[PDB]
Design a protein around this ligand. Structure first.
Ligand SMILES: CN1C(=N)N[C@@]2(c3ccc(-c4ccc(F)c(C#N)c4)s3)CN(c3ccccc3)C[C@H]2C1=O
Length: 390
């Protein structure tokens, strides 16, 4: 592990998001910021809000610069509106550098800040193409790389606890690591396997095969990436295109058929509980996603366990049972490899080489009989045909 200053710098959980501490302004104002590989704006609360105990106060920063322009982001998971500007930004448990970056000061919002959560802003780590209002607003990481000698790469280790963390626990527990500018070998086991970044906007990738307990879902691979497949730390679930979700759930139900679960469980709405320690992990199947490799006609697979796709939740009766929600859900905007997927792996966003690497995470939850895996290579033909074009 060569990046000790950044190891264990994240806090949070899949249902709340994972955040890192950052400072903005002069003198520095500390804020907790959600790490989001699914967007490209650095946006922070900049006005009082019932669910925030602190916010960016531009009038107290001597280095604040007003861009005299607004920004409006429509409902996705809450909507917000703000004013653009720039200021000096740093990451305390990060690279020892300070950079001038764009900041969207959020002044009005709806269903964006969450009651009970501990983050006050979001750090969009994707590319300029999807930045708002348009691609002229340079994202934070681009600024960081342009202004310093930090390598054009970051890596994320999101650590699910495997059980519920209460209010106090989630604040005191280490939720993972965001290594800025490098790869820390203490965070994974085995080898790193890389898949190409198909296009630089979201972190888009191409899935070429899907298995449920080794059984091929057998769909035209284009369906797996309709209309795109992305890696998104800002999404809790593994989200799959409608048709794929339908086929996958049928197969997961069949594999776990020795126990019947209500429709509400498969819809991700209701929890299921078992007596303490008796969760029947073994009846649930492993899920493997094969990704295009860097070599022609070669692919590799990442395999997750039910310990990744069943999200631990507190029982309504705060009993002693072990309860969970099914964290695979449908999407009309493509596959989203969210926290569910990311908690099983150390993920390397190698922007410099336009590729994303995966290795088994040193903090993934498993049991004595099965473990998450990253394996290859496999011979796979016509993988380009798996990508979707509008
Ligand atoms: C899926 N997703 C996302 N990855 N980022 C955004 C998020 C807003 C709130 C998020 C949130 C809140 C609580 C949580 F627990 C988790 C998790 N996990 C995530 S993610 C920012 N965004 C966006 C930003 C700027 C311009 C355009 C779009 C599009 C939003 C969105 O729908």
């Amino acid at each position: 592990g060569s990046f000790v200053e950044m190891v264990d710098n994240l806090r949070g959980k899949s249902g709340q998001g994972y955040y890192v501490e950052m400072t903005v302004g002069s003198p520095p104002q500390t804020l907790n910021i959600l790490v989001d590989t699914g967007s490209s704006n650095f946006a922070v609360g900049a006005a009082p809000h019932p669910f925030l105990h602190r916010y960016y106060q531009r009038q107290l920063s001597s280095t604040y610069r007003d861009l005299r322009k607004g920004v409006y982001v429509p409902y996705t998971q809450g909507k917000w509106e703000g004013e653009l500007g720039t200021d000096l930004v740093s990451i305390p448990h990060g690279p020892n550098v300070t950079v001038r970056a764009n900041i969207a000061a959020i002044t009005e919002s709806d269903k964006f800040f969450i009651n009970g959560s501990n983050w006050e802003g979001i750090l969009g780590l994707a590319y300029a193409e999807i930045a708002r209002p348009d691609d002229s607003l340079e994202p934070f990481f681009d600024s960081l790389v342009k202004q310093t000698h930090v390598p054009n790469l970051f890596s994320l280790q999101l650590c699910g606890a495997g059980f519920p963390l209460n209010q106090s626990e989630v604040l005191a527990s280490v939720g993972g690591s965001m290594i800025i500018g490098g790869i820390d070998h203490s965070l994974y086991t085995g080898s790193l396997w890389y898949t190409p970044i198909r296009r630089e906007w979201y972190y888009e990738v191409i899935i070429v095969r899907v298995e449920i307990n080794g059984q091929d879902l057998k769909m035209d691979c284009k369906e797996y990436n309709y209309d795109k497949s992305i890696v998104d730390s800002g999404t809790t679930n593994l989200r799959l295109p409608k048709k794929v979700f339908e086929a996958a759930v049928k197969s997961i139900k069949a594999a776990s058929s020795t126990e019947k679960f209500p429709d509400g469980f498969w819809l991700g709405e209701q929890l299921v509980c078992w007596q303490a320690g008796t969760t029947p992990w073994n009846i649930f199947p492993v899920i493997s996603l094969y990704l295009m490799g860097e070599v022609t006609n070669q692919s590799f697979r990442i395999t997750i366990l039910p310990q990744q796709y069943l999200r631990p939740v507190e029982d309504v009766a705060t009993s002693q049972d072990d309860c969970y929600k099914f964290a695979i859900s449908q999407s009309s905007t493509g596959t989203v490899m969210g926290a569910v997927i990311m908690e099983g792996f150390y993920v390397v966003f190698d922007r410099a080489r336009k590729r994303i690497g995966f290795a088994v995470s040193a903090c993934h939850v498993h049991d004595e009989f099965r473990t998450a895996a990253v394996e290859g290579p496999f011979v796979t033909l016509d993988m380009e045909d798996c990508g979707y074009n509008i």
